[PDB]
Design a protein around this ligand. Structure first.
Ligand SMILES: N[C@H]1[C@H](OC[C@H]2O[C@H](OP(=O)(O)O)[C@H](N)[C@H](O)[C@@H]2O)O[C@H](CO[C@]2(C(=O)O)C[C@@H](O[C@]3(C(=O)O)C[C@@H](O)[C@@H](O)[C@@H]([C@H](O)CO)O3)[C@@H](O)[C@@H]([C@H](O)CO)O2)[C@@H](OP(=O)(O)O)[C@@H]1O
Ligand code: C8E
Ligand code: C8E
Ligand code: C8E
Ligand code: CA
Ligand code: CA
Ligand code: CA
Lengths: 340, 198, 340, 340, 198, 199
């Protein structure tokens, strides 16, 4: 919602309130996604200042308030800042923004992150270059300096965050992406690599000097149809956890598949189906092991640009004895979403 | 061709003249008299919702996924948002989603050309053919309609019937003022059940 | 403050900055409300989108930032999300909203919750049906489907929140309320009942499978007068705490009274006086015992619709030797309130 | 950004997104300011209601979201409410506001608090009168009841905040400031004194009943030039910490100097140079010891009133063997800032 | 009728003269001279605040709770917001909240019709009646006025007096230019004190 | 003025003008403007001009115009940090008073306090050279930025800066062949630019 536009500065202040609720066998401990209330709300701004003919300056901040907590001891459980960065867009020669922002290998994984509530399984937050991440300087450039329309590249440096948990820490890394979009089709490729911190080196699971993730993607977005594929491999980056030994760490290798197909009906309903399989290879003391594996059928019904409601049902394929303990039961979500 | 006309007429005389004037019609007055309007169409809202998944199944079985996905939205919005079916939200939403007649497995059978066999006319039930009445009961072999108990089903059947009968409290003259009420009756079943079969 | 209204979607963003300060004898450990600075601020949005002639969509999110904290280790003390829900309003056949929202029995207790700073003592937050609460589906219907003007009913389902503390947990529950308002008078009645979680069972205080709370209310809101009464009984729901044995849990029965009388002068001052008594029954190891007992004499002064200032004086009747350890001293508060 | 102005009430909703990054030797434990990502964002409202010709009511709330945190366990680190107050401004007889607000001795310390990223080292948050602090009633009066232009005084009462850490606590205090500004020059004097809480007494460093801070300042702000000097002494207030013994507390005495000289060029660049030396006196087991000592040269570049970018270089003079363990290495920061 | 009138004249000559030209009038010069306006009406702001609860008490005692609740607001807003009574926020707020003359227990006696008995005139005090001066002292039995110490009360009596003496420093002619200066003084005490009990 | 090595400089100018220009520089300066894209070309000329900016700032200070010096500091600041390590000229897209100009290095400061060039010389492959500027400029390789480049790095900077000016001048060729004395025109253009820089 653009709530300010005066003297060459427009301020979009947006947010949502999502009444969410999950359903899984038992108390949902062994399930794919959980059980119970999942209500949340978000609140953010995008700012945008016209400096002059060439320069545009922008800054974005986006936060997640949770609504399934009590007003007591656990009140802030799961509150977080999802994005906060500033940057500069120059005339024809691209854009440069440093802050908390999306990793570059998300440029590929975004292809298959279209599901109503689930999906996007391999785009782990705070995991180097896939999904969001802190301290990233990103240069992006669309239509190749004005010379080749549809062709975009982005290249990004990952500033080291050495935190208290190995899960949420990273060394220095560099990475980039390229995409071509031509008449409804989209090809995309992303690759980044980065040093692992000393604390990540010392984890029972995952071993190696450098982490690297890459992903590629096909898509077809045209004619009320959406098809998308993503394939990607990681070395020493996809976080894992053996719930049997209560160790954690990183997968030594993962081979990831993501497929999406959805159609948008003229009356409002956008049914979707998905398949995901993230296979981990050479996990310490385990070997090969599936981290993710499912078919998803779901639907969002759009009342308009401000109100919507969905059902997302996961058919979980993860086994009863997935050695890392990855949960195997099915999960289904129901949401009503007001967004502004 | 009506092979059992002699039985079916003996039974239509049974239905048209003893069980309608002395049971249904008073019930339909006290229904329309003492039951409020939100109640009544809220019940027809609620019972048609329970057929909606079976309609969605069979529109797919016949080969029309658009109708099926229209009927999925009906059940989805009505059960989840609109209060378990009591409220027709998939209708206040888009005009393309407004309620229609049920398409069950009886429609699917004929839509591939099967045939009713003989027509029959049951006391208290009325019109019945093997293909639709009965062929429709296959949709009680998979969710929603499988969740109803035998008392739930006879009440759904009876709550729906009392409602259709109460709407017609004045169209009676259109049926007393025809030379053959039976053949207008028999011809109205094949009227609807063949449009349903397209 | 309506800060957006374009294309059938309005966005109300509101807040307040309340300078609060309590005064109690000593450090206020034995007081009604405590001693010292109690300053806080709130921020929320109310959303509202006209989908078409019948459907309206809404969403609300409301948060509480505290201003009596330091910027240090305790910075989040008491910062919480009060409300976060979305929903749909159907033409005449009512309204349906799921999220973190008020319980159904607040429909009755609101009658007596009008005081400048205190009062509303039996509407505990995260306490089943009487205050704000998670995973609540609420169906409300006003003026009875258009048929009976002044008559509103509500019915609400409470999905189980199995939290870490029994204070903040509940099993699955259902409840409803009714009110008739006819020319300034108001009657209301509400009742809810809900399974108790295993952890609430294992508490020293309170014992039983189901919790239930109900409350009723008379009010007269007309011609600058406000009168309001509430009576209510709870079984196994009002959370209590034995400050002597340092056990806690729930009162096995409570019988609660609240009376309010306030008058609004034309020059801005709205004095109020109230009475509150929550008596506990059949407490483990105690028996009958008072949880709440006071007279309040107070006043809110209204500068305009944006600024106000109040003093709320509690005359505490809880005894010096309350066997549950309830504090017995007086508390007086002074607030200055900017809201937009 | 004034996002509402209707019925004599304007509501400014403001914020910023600052992409920050510090550079210091090594892991930056011995730094002035640290090493690595420092991204943060702010969000606030300022309120204002015209009651009539004389009375106006105001309210302000400001929060700090950090963006250098993870989305996991540490998500709220350093998130805080910086301000929350309400008040009344009377025609000519001054202004009175209560809440979390700046201490009165900041009226002097602000003079030299002009650097792009650092400086203002003596304006500790939650430290009695020199910076933000909870429960302060502040009365200010500009142009001496309309009689003496340029002459402002303010006088403030500090309600005791007895918090869990001695670092963040204070007893009851009173304090005031006076400033004269006449054609670009500005002289100022501020002084506060306050009871110390019992826990501040039981700390290894610092001993005494009453804490006090005072500071004065000369400044020259005119013709694109800024000069500022501050001198100030504190008794029992400046928090300190011996990194060797892992004891902490309060300095027994401090003598504080701050110098700033900055110039604004017409083409956009605002260089600055500064000097700061906060020397501690009478430290337990240590004696005299430097808390702060640097030359700072830095510069902000302004794209317009909405976008800016700065670099701030601290030339640290703290010794390799600062007896209290104050880190000695240099730090430099670089920021890009979008604000609305 | 003034029974002790002969004593009151001998003390009025004392108060109007010898104690006015040689003491009072010099002090009232240095008051308007060296004291600024913000100080004076800010001091009058602060001294009037302390009677507000006693005015509130007696307005209730007289039977118009509207008047009393206005003075509760006066005290409320002034002491909390307007700087301990120094700033009149309950006055800049609403027109209906402006400061007025005090109604103390002397008025409550008169609103129930109590003769003053005799009028008297004391050295240094000036005008006094058993009913009002004295009946006014009854409000020191309950908060604010009961909180004052003997040093506190005599200063309040003295500074408020200096202000009243300094404001009238030039209307002297209406009393110098009257054939009878005393009896308008005696009757001006009964002018002010009789409208207050209405 | 007076050109003492004129016989040598002419012999080497015939070298540069008539064999190393037509047989080496000029073909490469063609393939430059042929196969290198414009964002690449002015992006590299953005990037090499960037590294002289701190030494220009050093030297504008040494000459006594801190205003110019701080203008060139900003050039370096905005371009290096924001505009992608110098590749993008944001301190120019920002203010007009910040646009790129000729470099003033330590050759300029020397002349600004008035020291002769000594003799003019013309080296093969270098072209115009004087002790004061070509060479006297090398003192700015004694302190930040330019002090950071290696022998392969710096001669490449000289080479890309050179190929660009030659490729920008690929059609002004007639203006130098069609003069009775190309040498005295090239030599007087060396004293032209290097005298404007010392103003
Ligand atoms: N402003 C000077 C400051 O004074 C103030 C208070 O004095 C009055 O308090 P009283 O004791 O009469 O009840 C009064 N209430 C008034 O409101 C002021 O608040 O004092 C210091 C130094 O005072 C000393 C002295 O002669 O050196 C030292 C005091 O002790 C120290 C201590 O450790 O013993 C050291 C300080 O670091 C500090 O911790 C103080 C605490 O405030 C203790 O309360 O204690 C103490 O012995 C006092 C005696 O009370 C004197 O009666 O004397 C002075 O500093 P300077 O650098 O030496 O000039 C301030 O200028
Ligand atoms: C958006 C509206 C959704 C509101 C629905 C909340 C309903 C909460 O009830 C959960 C129903 O499931 C209860 C299951 O009971 C225990 C079963 O545990 C074993 C599972 O097989
Ligand atoms: C505003 C953009 C800032 C982004 C810069 C990221 C660079 C961080 O890495 C620097 C660390 O390397 C320094 C050497 O190690 C010290 C020992
Ligand atoms: C024709 C009139 C103006 C003259 C043009 C000046 C052009 C200067 O700006 C162009 C800069 O753009 C170069 C882009 O180079 C790529 C940078 O990003 C590479 C990623 O590492
Ligand atoms: Ca490995
Ligand atoms: Ca029980
Ligand atoms: Ca001391």
């Amino acid at each position: 919602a653009e709530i300010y536009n005066k003297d060459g500065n427009k301020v979009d202040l947006y947010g949502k309130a999502v009444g969410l609720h999950y359903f899984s066998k038992g108390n949902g401990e062994n399930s794919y996604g959980g059980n119970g209330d999942m209500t949340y709300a978000r609140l953010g701004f995008k700012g945008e200042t016209q400096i002059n003919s060439d320069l545009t300056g922008y800054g974005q901040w986006e936060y997640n308030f949770q609504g399934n907590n009590s007003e007591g001891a656990d009140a802030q459980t799961g509150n977080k800042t999802r994005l906060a960065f500033a940057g500069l867009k120059y005339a024809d020669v691209g854009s440069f923004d440093y802050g908390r922002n999306y990793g570059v290998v998300y440029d590929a994984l975004g292809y298959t992150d279209m599901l109503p509530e689930f999906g996007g399984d391999t785009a782990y937050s705070d995991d180097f270059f896939v999904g969001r991440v802190g301290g990233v300087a990103t240069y992006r450039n669309s239509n190749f300096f004005g010379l080749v329309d549809g062709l975009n590249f982005a290249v990004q440096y990952l500033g080291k965050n050495e935190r208290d948990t190995a899960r949420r820490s990273n060394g220095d890394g560099v990475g980039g992406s390229i995409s071509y979009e031509y008449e409804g089709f989209g090809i995309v490729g992303a690759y980044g690599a980065a040093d692992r911190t000393n604390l990540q080196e010392a984890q029972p699971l995952g071993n190696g000097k450098k982490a690297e993730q890459w992903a590629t993607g096909l898509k077809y977005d045209a004619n009320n149809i959406y098809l998308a594929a993503n394939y990607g491999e990681t070395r020493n980056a996809t976080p894992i956890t053996n719930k049997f030994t209560n160790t954690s760490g990183f997968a030594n290798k993962t081979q990831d598949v993501l497929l999406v197909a959805q159609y948008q009906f003229d009356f409002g309903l956008r049914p979707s189906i998905a398949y995901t399989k993230s296979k981990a290879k050479d996990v310490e003391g385990i070997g090969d092991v599936d981290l993710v594996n499912y078919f998803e059928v779901g639907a969002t019904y759009y009342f308009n640009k401000n109100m919507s409601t969905y059902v997302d049902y996961i058919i979980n394929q993860i086994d009863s004895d997935n050695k890392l303990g990855v949960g195997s039961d099915d999960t289904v979500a129901v949401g009503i979403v007001y967004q502004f | 061709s009506d092979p059992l006309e002699g039985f079916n007429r003996t039974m239509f005389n049974f239905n048209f003249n003893v069980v309608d004037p002395y049971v249904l019609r008073p019930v339909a007055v006290a229904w329309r008299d003492y039951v409020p309007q939100p109640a009544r169409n809220g019940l027809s809202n609620f019972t048609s919702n329970l057929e909606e998944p079976a309609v969605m199944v069979n529109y797919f079985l016949q080969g029309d996924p658009y109708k099926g996905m229209v009927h999925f939205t009906r059940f989805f919005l009505n059960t989840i948002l609109g209060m378990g079916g009591l409220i027709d939200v998939a209708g206040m939403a888009n005009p393309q989603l407004q309620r229609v007649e049920p398409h069950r497995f009886g429609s699917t059978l004929g839509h591939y050309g099967v045939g009713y066999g003989p027509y029959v006319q049951l006391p208290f039930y009325g019109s019945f053919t093997l293909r639709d009445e009965g062929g429709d009961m296959a949709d009680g072999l998979y969710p929603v309609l499988s969740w109803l108990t035998w008392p739930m089903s006879i009440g759904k059947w009876a709550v729906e019937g009392i409602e259709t009968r109460a709407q017609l409290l004045d169209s009676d003259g259109l049926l007393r003022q025809s030379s053959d009420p039976y053949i207008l009756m028999r011809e109205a079943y094949f009227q609807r059940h063949d449009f349903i079969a397209n």
